[PDB]
Write a protein that binds this ligand. Structure first.
Ligand code: HEM
Ligand code: SF4
Ligand code: SF4
Ligand code: SF4
Ligand code: F3S
Ligand SMILES: [Mo+6]
Lengths: 220, 1244, 509
């Protein structure tokens, strides 16, 4: 168990982190034509409006909470961040899960979507739904330690992982098992990221907000 | 690194523009190579479409990755004069989608055979080492023959091999020829102009073995009998570029933009030159979109509008204000001044035959063929036999021309037109009128069945002491039209508003077209013609030519053009466009296609009579002859079933027969030898005695039906074949969807020339072999399917009526999988046949019947009336009162050697056509060098015919259209007849020799030839009849001029000596089936029209996904909104259309442009795609020809009479079909009959 | 003032025979792949009708093109930058596959493999190219309404029937139809380029062709809504959008587009147009949409003006391009004769593919009528195609330019007829519409005779300028996969070099 604990929380994090980065770079340089969102909306618009929005607005809330949550004193003691994460993040998570579930019911049972889908699209979406379900499931476990004791552990781990500080696994001494599953499945998603449709995330079109409307390319 | 490039974000931004609205970027664009490499290709090869469309468009075939990927039109056609637009790019949507077929899911890759047939074949070969005898063991067993014939069209095809199928085919051919006769083997292939050598392949094999070659021009109803009637020419029309020389055009029943797509620009562009255009279509057709005026007469009533228009023209441009141009034109170029004899009736006279030199005492000084020379009055009241009549063509030389001269003194005369002002008395002549008959669907105008008119006449002293009254065709014509000339004729018009025998008011009632419109266009058309000296044109198509009375529709249009002197003038005349019948290098191709280089004659047959007979469509006839007779004819002189008239036609040598005799024609000689008589005499003696009979008399006896049929470049069973259900039943012997009862079942009257039996003979064909590149409807019902090469995988040539260029078909890549070109397929069959026949057929003697031929001296058969020898009205004289009885030697073991070499007859006898012949030795010497020669064997020393290219080179070197050397010799030959030099028409191109490889580089314009009446010149466009009018070469008609008056007995008694309005006929095919099998939904009778579709050429391309995707995804039928709403039919609902002949299923296209009363199922969408089961037959839904049936017309069976003599595709019965009516209804149950459990049910 | 050039296209609807050859050739070459089998870069629609995709001209439903705000600034009807971004997770206006049609195929092999002993003739039923499942029935296609196929009340929903009392056209005698072949407009103010979040769409500087960079496109599928002509098609398989590429691989060497060279009716004209890129926004944002047509004409430059020529050179336009621009049929039809009009100028994109309105048979009248100013030939007032309809299609509802074009065409006809039939010179119709004898003669040369060299005057895109054609000539096409194409920086992870480049630098300078 100590062996697994070290593999999964000291080693695996760097394997998935290295594969995530080099896998993204390499697919960007040698697979531009494969770098797309892979929309399926046109093949079946039904329910996509509600489903995709729910899922995306939701998962993006979580992602913001997780980001500023674990990677960032007086006005923001861990206990206050925990509460925000539980209510704000829990709400986003419920929106995400519903959307995710709807998108999956569509991908599996909408004849046109199912017929033209790829294995990865089913796998990745499935793992996200499960990850989001696990996530919400940690809420009742964090609810047993409203002082932010668990959160302090998870955040200790995350921060020592990203600053390449060994022993990160220690920070997790005794956290509720559920959190372990969530961390592992969540990291796995990073490992599968460069080989899935998830690469669209790298392309969030922020430059658009400030770009001139007409583009003209000179001879080249 | 594309990743690192991003960081150059800032460095890649250049200048902004439009005040910050735009940004110029200097970023990478290499990705653009992606589309560039798709366009890039290996090479381009020139080829064209071997399909029947008249397009004849040269394409660029792109090969990429060693495969055919797409095509774009060639644009390098030799450019036309500077004042004319050029032809490029031509092409159409169908042609653009052909590449699809090469590797598509419907490509035929291997020879296929019906499983049941294969199993019996292999088991028979295990008991019979000889294949002929293995076949016999199968075919002679009733149960074996039936197990595979009823398997036809019911799956079970298995992959075979060329070795297997070739032996079975050869075995079957040998056996059939040996036991029944060569003419029991037949082949059907259409329009050779689209792929000359491909057609020639099967035709050559068949000709050498004595098989019958079936016609197509008449069968498809593209033949306008009116042309052979008026000009004695099958069909000759001006080229499309000539439309640009016209200043007034009427598109009458011709959907130019949809059916003549590559030439449409000439029509849309000439408009910019000031030319006015008028569209005449019942529906708002595509053609209407391009005209200045849209006239919509009720479908089938067109002749009425023509007559009315002709009326005004005569009144205003011939009578009231005589046009100097029109007057001289009809005087010198029509039979108007010719004299017609009046026949005594009871209180009135009837127009009889034309006066002949022979009727006058002096015979007018005519000793040669005086009974074949027409007569007229010169302006000094003298009688005369003018040059040009068909009498001066044969038995003499120098006077067969249109120089206005006296055929006796050789001096110039001036023919007078009307006797008015020189009459001895006014006689009353009865003119037939049918404008009051017809069904309830067309308006009628009651008058009298016989209209008496006052005609000026002159009494003459005949050469037999009798006295008779005569008058001009001209007077008879103005009377027939209803022109009041001062005799106070009660049946003549007092004004255009006078409802009478041919007025604008009269026509308005029949057609529904405002009289004022009829009058305005009539004037304008004639005014323009007068101003420009004939530059008025009428483009007509199947919209008019596919009706039962097509001749009336046509003569109506023709008369208008003649009255305005438009025929023979560039920019004017009759522009008939239908199928691609113009194979220009004719006399170069004929000897190749029918083996005239080895044996003469071949066995040609007119397909309409052939299928009417063998598919037993006659046993269901509803139309009788008596109901078509003139009211002025002795109805008792014309009793019998319509087929009876055909049989009589056959024995009188007017039409061909197939099979010919009731006995194997290879055994006749061996019997003439034991009788001490030569073959010909023994057969005539036997015919009289009745020991030998014409096969037509007993088609169901078991030995007079065809047994082996080859189908290639055709989709007969499916598409083409009228009476689809009848073919399935009597020719194939499979399930059929016929709904009605036959004569025997309705207790009708049996024919008087043909045996009758209550249970018709079924499944007559023993073996059906189809060659194709796609599994068509015909293949689906065949026994053996042979994978043929697509147009992009073989060499061949193509020509057309639309332009003067001859270009090729070329193999871009070798035929895929196991496919072979038609030429190689038939050569291999010929090769296996030559082996297999050893011991069964040797050097045989064949007795062949050949009907009397037009353009041969024999055309002068029966000059004054009709005598049937079997009725003892005359002796049996082959070549005059009966067909010629020819002797032909056949060397069956040498078939292959003959097939692959140009025979000796081209050297021994020469070459020729259309009444002329010439020496062609020089050409054969040239050919020995281009094709190399046989090193040994039966054909040692003769030029070779191994490849399709050698065959093509044969055609080019022999034809006058492609070899200036031959062109001059040909014009020289003609010059002997006319006494006028015509060589000047080709001297300036005598050095011209079109080569196959040169046309692969660039299409070449052909050479002016006597085979045609238009010229290939740099200053004047090709215009039909141009030579007749400008070179004074007479039309091959009784009078040598354009014949307005048809004086043949049958023509007169069937009321068609002069044109007259004839309402659509009643096929009585709806009232006996309507309601009989209700499904709950309403039913209604509608006129069923089948114009040619936009998503295919006939059925070709119909299965092409691109066409199916741009169309409606499969078989569909157009209905007017009103008819659809009445029947509860919504757009795209499944409907069923049916009648006595069968049923079809399809989806509806509801549209406003379709006038109530008519429905349109664009021709051919066939039987293989998206068709559910029929609720009427419980079988797979049928096709558009499941509801049609062949019904012949006697006037089309006339032979042995000048312009009305036979010729392959020149004359014969036609397969008209626009008169048909059907029952339409919304379908209820939609069962697919495929065990997929995926059926539907339509509501209400 | 920044001069740029582009090869524009003019289609003479008067000569269009509605044959679709143009659509087939494009399909065979560019869109036969799975993913775009339903896409028809070039498609021809019969009007009245709703087109393909269904009712694409309805901008209130589809949200295509530009709108001019109250402050005068331009904005995509789709919404501004943030509005558009807010719709990215699910484009609310995106057309579905059913708005085009469900691509289908047939089971031909059943005709081949049907087992012996079948109880009915075998047949080939339809199957979906999207699902592979049996299709019970084909209910739609890209050219479903061809030749007035459908009930009038259905076809008449045509957005162009707005403001027209259309009842009279449901009567058989007043029936009318015309053909509208269309492709991408390659606009001067493209909405697609403005509505793409990743900036993957651009207008090439040298020839004005607008492309979707297949490398850079991210599949945000917003551009489809942006294009008011609905000429951008989503490739459902690749996940990226594709569209008419104006056959640049051919145009680049001076060849006409495939749909231009293959046009059977000889109605397409290709010619250069010089334009002021600096005037684009100004012209596209004019207040009255009825002025957009003329405002665009004002953005076009006169190729024979030495002021324009001199500026063109200064701005980089190749000499051969300037020469082509001086013999441009497109310039003659759009600027001189005023025969060609833009397609839906009200979308404010400044379309570069224009049209000559069609003539039509005369309307149904009480009697055969009588001669008019043009003799037996028709007067513009007798034409059966309602001019208001043509105006809604080409001139934002203004009938003036449509009538001027139609009338001038008829004028040419009247004049030419006097000449070829009567043999006289009658300029009465010309003077009436302001055409000189020479202009009419030149109109006739181009429209009627239409020699190949006159319909297509395409200059080279000069791929040698600002690039290195020599090494390209030597190594292009060897697609072994060097992994260095597509980027300007030489470093690459696979430690390789370009096959079509010279990496051994000259040391002699
Ligand atoms: C490797 C990446 C991830 C890590 C390290 C991670 C870590 C965590 C932690 C430590 C918590 C509990 C917070 C506390 O201690 O109070 C949590 C909760 C949660 N996570 Fe994640 N997570 C990851 C990815 C994801 C993803 C991809 C999803 C969406 C499918 C997700 C959805 C949730 C939800 C719904 C909750 C519960 C409510 C909340 O805290 O907002 N997580 N995650
Ligand atoms: S099918 Fe006929 S008209 Fe069409 S491109 Fe081929 S040859 Fe030309
Ligand atoms: S027509 Fe072409 S350039 Fe214009 S907006 Fe649409 S896709 Fe863009
Ligand atoms: S090819 Fe030309 S004439 Fe035919 S539909 Fe296309 S644009 Fe019209
Ligand atoms: S919005 Fe842009 S990302 Fe692609 S799908 Fe359209 S070009
Ligand atoms: Mo035909």
């Amino acid at each position: 168990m100590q062996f697994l604990n070290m593999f999964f929380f000291d080693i695996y994090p760097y394997i998935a982190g290295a594969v995530f980065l080099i896998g993204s770079w390499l697919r960007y340089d040698y697979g531009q034509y494969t770098w797309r969102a892979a929309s399926s909306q046109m093949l079946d618009r039904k329910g996509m409006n509600l489903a995709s929005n729910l899922f995306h607005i939701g998962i993006l809330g979580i992602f913001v909470g997780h980001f500023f949550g674990m990677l960032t004193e007086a006005w923001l003691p861990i206990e206050v961040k925990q509460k925000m994460a539980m209510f704000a993040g829990g709400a986003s998570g419920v929106l995400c899960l519903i959307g995710g579930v709807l998108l999956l019911k569509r991908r599996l049972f909408s004849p046109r979507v199912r017929a033209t889908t790829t294995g990865a699209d089913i796998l990745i979406l499935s793992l996200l739904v499960i990850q989001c379900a696990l996530g919400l499931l940690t809420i009742p476990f964090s609810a047993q330690h409203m002082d932010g004791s668990e959160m302090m552990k998870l955040v200790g781990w995350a921060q020592s992982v990203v600053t390449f500080h060994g022993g990160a696994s220690q920070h997790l001494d005794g956290v509720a098992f559920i959190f372990r599953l969530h961390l592992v499945l969540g990291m796995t998603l990073f490992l599968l990221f460069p080989f899935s449709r998830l690469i669209h995330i790298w392309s969030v079109p922020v430059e658009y907000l400030t770009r001139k409307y007409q583009l003209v390319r000179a001879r080249h | 690194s594309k990743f690192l490039d991003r960081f150059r974000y800032f460095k890649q931004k250049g200048e902004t523009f439009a005040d910050g609205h735009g940004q110029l970027l200097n970023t990478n664009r290499d990705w653009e190579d992606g589309y560039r490499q798709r366009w890039q290709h290996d090479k381009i090869v020139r080829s064209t479409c071997g399909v029947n469309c008249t397009g004849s468009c040269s394409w660029k075939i792109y090969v990429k990755n060693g495969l055919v990927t797409w095509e774009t039109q060639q644009t390098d056609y030799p450019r036309t004069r500077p004042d004319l637009p050029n032809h490029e790019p031509r092409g159409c949507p169908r042609g653009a989608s052909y590449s699809w077929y090469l590797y598509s899911a419907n490509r035929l890759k291997y020879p296929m055979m019906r499983k049941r047939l294969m199993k019996m074949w292999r088991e028979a070969k295990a008991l019979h080492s000889d294949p002929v005898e293995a076949w016999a063991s199968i075919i002679e067993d009733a149960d074996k023959a039936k197990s595979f014939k009823q398997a036809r069209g019911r799956g079970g095809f298995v992959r075979s091999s060329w070795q297997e199928v070739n032996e079975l085919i050869a075995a079957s051919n040998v056996y059939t020829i040996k036991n029944y006769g060569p003419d029991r083997v037949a082949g059907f292939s259409p329009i050779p102009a689209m792929s000359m050598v491909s057609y020639a392949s099967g035709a050559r094999y068949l000709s050498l073995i004595g098989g019958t070659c079936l016609s197509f021009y008449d069968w498809y109803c593209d033949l306008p009998p009116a042309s052979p009637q008026t000009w004695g020419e099958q069909t000759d029309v001006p080229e499309s570029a000539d439309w640009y020389n016209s200043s007034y055009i009427i598109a009458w029943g011709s959907n130019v933009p949809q059916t003549r797509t590559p030439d449409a620009h000439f029509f849309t562009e000439v408009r910019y030159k000031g030319t006015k255009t008028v569209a005449v279509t019942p529906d708002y057709a595509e053609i209407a979109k391009l005209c200045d005026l849209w006239l919509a007469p009720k479908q089938g009533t067109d002749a009425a509008m023509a007559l009315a228009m002709g009326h005004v023209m005569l009144r205003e441009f011939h009578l009231d204000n005589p046009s100097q141009y029109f007057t001289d034109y009809v005087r010198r170029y029509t039979d108007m001044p010719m004299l017609v004899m009046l026949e005594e009736r009871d209180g009135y006279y009837a127009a009889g035959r034309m006066l002949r030199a022979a009727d006058l005492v002096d015979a007018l000084g005519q000793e040669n063929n005086p009974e074949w020379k027409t007569v007229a009055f010169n302006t000094n009241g003298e009688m005369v036999a003018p040059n040009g009549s068909i009498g001066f063509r044969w038995g003499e030389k120098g006077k067969w021309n249109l120089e206005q001269r006296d055929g006796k003194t050789g001096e110039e005369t001036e023919l007078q037109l009307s006797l008015l002002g020189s009459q001895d008395e006014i006689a009353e002549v009865g003119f037939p009128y049918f404008g009051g008959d017809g069904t309830e669907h067309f308006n009628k105008v009651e008058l009298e069945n016989v209209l008496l008119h006052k005609l000026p006449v002159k009494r003459l002293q005949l050469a037999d002491g009798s006295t008779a009254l005569v008058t001009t065709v001209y007077d008879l014509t103005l009377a027939n039209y209803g022109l009041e000339r001062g005799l106070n004729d009660v049946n003549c018009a007092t004004s255009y508003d006078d409802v009478k025998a041919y007025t604008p008011a009269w026509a308005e009632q029949i057609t529904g077209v405002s009289r004022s419109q009829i009058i305005r266009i009539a004037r304008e058309f004639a005014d323009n013609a007068d101003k420009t000296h004939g530059r008025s044109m009428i483009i007509v198509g199947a919209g008019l030519n596919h009706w039962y009375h097509l001749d009336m529709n046509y003569r109506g249009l023709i008369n208008m053009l003649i009255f305005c002197g438009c025929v023979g003038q560039s920019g004017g005349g009759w522009a008939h466009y239908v199928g691609q019948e113009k194979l220009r290098p004719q006399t170069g191709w004929q000897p190749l296609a029918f083996a005239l280089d080895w044996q003469r004659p071949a066995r040609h047959m007119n397909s309409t009579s052939y299928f009417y007979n063998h598919s037993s469509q006659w046993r269901y006839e509803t139309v009788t002859a008596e109901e078509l007779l003139s009211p002025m004819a002795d109805k008792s002189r014309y009793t019998g079933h319509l087929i009876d008239f055909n049989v009589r036609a056959e024995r009188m040598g007017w039409l061909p027969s197939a099979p010919q005799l009731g006995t194997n024609p290879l055994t006749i000689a061996g019997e003439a030898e034991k009788a001490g008589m030569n073959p010909v005499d023994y057969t005539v003696k036997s015919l009289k005695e009745g020991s030998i009979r014409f096969a037509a008399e007993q088609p169901e006896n078991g030995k007079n039906h065809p047994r082996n049929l080859f189908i290639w470049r055709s989709n007969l069973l499916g598409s083409s074949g009228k009476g689809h259900e009848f073919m399935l039943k009597y020719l194939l012997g499979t399930e059929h969807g016929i709904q009605g009862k036959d004569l025997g079942q309705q207790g009708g009257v049996k024919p008087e020339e043909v045996d009758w039996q209550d249970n018709g003979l079924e499944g007559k064909l023993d073996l059906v072999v189809t060659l194709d590149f796609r599994l068509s409807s015909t293949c689906l019902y065949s026994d053996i399917i042979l994978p043929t090469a697509t147009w992009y995988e073989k060499d061949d040539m193509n020509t057309s009526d639309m332009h003067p260029f001859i270009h090729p078909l070329s193999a871009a890549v070798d035929p895929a999988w196991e496919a072979k070109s038609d030429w190689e397929i038939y050569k291999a069959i010929a090769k296996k046949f030559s082996e297999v026949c050893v011991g069964h057929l040797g050097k045989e003697t064949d007795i062949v019947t050949l009907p009397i031929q037009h353009d041969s001296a024999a055309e002068l058969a029966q000059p004054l009336d009709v005598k049937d020898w079997k009725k003892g009205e005359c002796d049996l004289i082959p070549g005059k009162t009966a067909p010629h009885i020819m002797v032909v030697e056949r060397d069956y073991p040498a078939t292959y050697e003959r097939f692959t070499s140009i025979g000796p007859l081209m050297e021994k006898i020469g070459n020729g056509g259309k009444g002329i012949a010439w020496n062609t030795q020089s050409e054969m010497d040239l050919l020995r060098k281009l094709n190399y020669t046989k090193a040994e064997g039966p054909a040692k020393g003769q030029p070779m015919l191994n490849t399709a290219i050698d065959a093509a080179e044969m055609i080019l070197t022999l034809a006058p259209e492609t070899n200036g050397q031959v062109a001059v010799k040909a014009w020289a030959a003609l010059s002997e007849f006319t006494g006028r030099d015509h060589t000047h028409l080709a001297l300036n191109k005598e050095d011209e020799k079109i080569r196959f490889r040169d046309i692969q580089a660039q299409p070449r314009k052909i050479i002016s030839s006597p085979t045609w009446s238009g010229l290939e010149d740099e200053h004047v466009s090709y215009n039909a009849g141009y030579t007749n009018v400008h070179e004074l070469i007479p039309w091959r008609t009784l009078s040598g001029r354009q014949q307005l008056y048809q004086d043949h007995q049958w023509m007169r008694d069937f009321g068609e000596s002069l044109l007259v309005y004839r309402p659509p006929i009643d096929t009585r095919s709806v009232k006996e089936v309507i309601g009989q099998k209700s499904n709950g939904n309403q039913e209604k009778a509608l006129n069923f029209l089948t114009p040619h579709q936009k998503w295919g050429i006939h059925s070709t391309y119909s299965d092409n996904l691109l066409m199916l995707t741009l169309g409606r995804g499969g078989p569909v039928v157009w209905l007017s909104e009103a008819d659809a709403k009445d029947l509860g039919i919504a757009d795209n609902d499944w409907i069923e259309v049916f009648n006595s002949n069968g049923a079809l299923t399809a989806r509806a296209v509801v549209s406003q442009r379709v006038p109530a009363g008519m429905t349109m199922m664009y021709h051919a969408q066939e039987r293989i795609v998206n068709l559910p089961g029929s609720e009427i037959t419980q079988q797979r839904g049928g096709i558009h020809n499941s509801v049609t049936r062949i019904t012949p017309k006697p006037t089309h069976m006339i032979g042995g009479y000048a312009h009305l003599a036979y010729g392959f595709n020149y004359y014969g019965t036609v397969g008209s079909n626009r008169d048909e009516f059907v029952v339409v209804r919304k379908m209820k149950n939609i069962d697919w009959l495929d065990g997929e459990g995926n059926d539907q049910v339509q509501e209400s | 003032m920044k001069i740029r050039s582009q090869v524009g296209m003019v289609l003479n609807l008067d000569k269009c025979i509605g044959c679709h050859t143009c659509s087939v050739t494009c399909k065979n070459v560019w869109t036969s792949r799975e993913g775009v089998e339903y896409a028809w870069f070039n498609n021809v629609e019969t009007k009245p009708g709703q087109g393909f995709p269904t009712d694409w001209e309805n901008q209130e439903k589809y949200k295509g093109g530009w709108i001019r705000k109250i402050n005068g600034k331009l904005q995509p009807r789709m919404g501004n930058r943030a509005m558009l971004l807010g719709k990215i997770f699910a484009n609310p206006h995106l057309p579905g596959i059913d708005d085009y049609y469900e691509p289908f195929d047939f089971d031909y092999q059943n005709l081949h493999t049907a087992p012996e002993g079948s109880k009915s003739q075998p047949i080939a039923r339809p199957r979906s190219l999207i699902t592979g499942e049996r299709m019970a029935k084909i209910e739609k296609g890209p050219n479903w309404e061809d030749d007035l196929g459908g009930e009038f009340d259905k076809l008449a929903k045509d957005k162009n029937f707005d403001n027209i009392q259309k009842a009279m056209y449901s009567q058989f005698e007043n029936t009318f139809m015309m053909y509208l072949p269309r492709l991408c407009e390659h606009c001067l103010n493209p909405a697609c380029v403005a509505t793409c979040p990743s900036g993957a769409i651009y207008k090439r500087e040298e020839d004005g062709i607008v492309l979707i960079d297949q490398d850079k496109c991210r599949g945000w599928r917003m551009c489809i809504t942006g294009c008011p002509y609905k000429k951008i098609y989503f490739n459902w398989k690749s996940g990226k959008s594709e569209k008419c590429i104006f056959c640049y691989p051919r145009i680049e060497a001076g060849q006409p587009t495939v749909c231009s060279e293959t046009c059977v009716g000889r109605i397409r004209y290709l010619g250069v147009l010089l334009y002021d890129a600096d005037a684009i926004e100004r012209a596209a944002s004019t207040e009255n949409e009825k002025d957009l047509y003329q405002r665009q004409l004002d953005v076009f430059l006169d190729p024979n003006d030495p002021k324009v020529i001199e500026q063109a050179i200064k701005d980089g336009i190749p000499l051969s391009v300037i020469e082509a621009a001086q013999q441009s049929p497109v310039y003659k039809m759009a600027m001189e004769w005023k025969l060609a009009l833009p397609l839906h100028p009200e979308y404010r994109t400044l379309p570069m593919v224009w049209y000559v309105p069609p003539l039509s048979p005369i309307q149904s009248a009480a009697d055969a009528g009588e001669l008019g100013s043009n003799g037996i030939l028709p007067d513009v007032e007798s034409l059966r195609i309602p001019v208001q309809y043509l105006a809604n299609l080409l001139t934002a509802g203004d009938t003036k330019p449509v009538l001027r074009a139609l009338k001038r065409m008829l004028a040419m006809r009247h004049y030419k007829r006097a000449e070829t039939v009567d043999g006289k010179v009658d300029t009465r119709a010309l003077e009436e519409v302001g055409l000189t004898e020479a202009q009419a003669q030149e109109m006739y040369r181009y429209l009627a005779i239409a020699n190949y060299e006159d319909r297509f005057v395409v200059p080279s895109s000069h791929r040698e300028l600002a690039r290195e054609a020599f090494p390209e000539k030597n190594g292009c096409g060897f697609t072994f996969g060097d992994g260095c194409h597509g980027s300007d920086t030489k470093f690459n992870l696979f430690n390789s070099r370009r096959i079509d480049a010279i990496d051994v630098t000259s040391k002699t300078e």
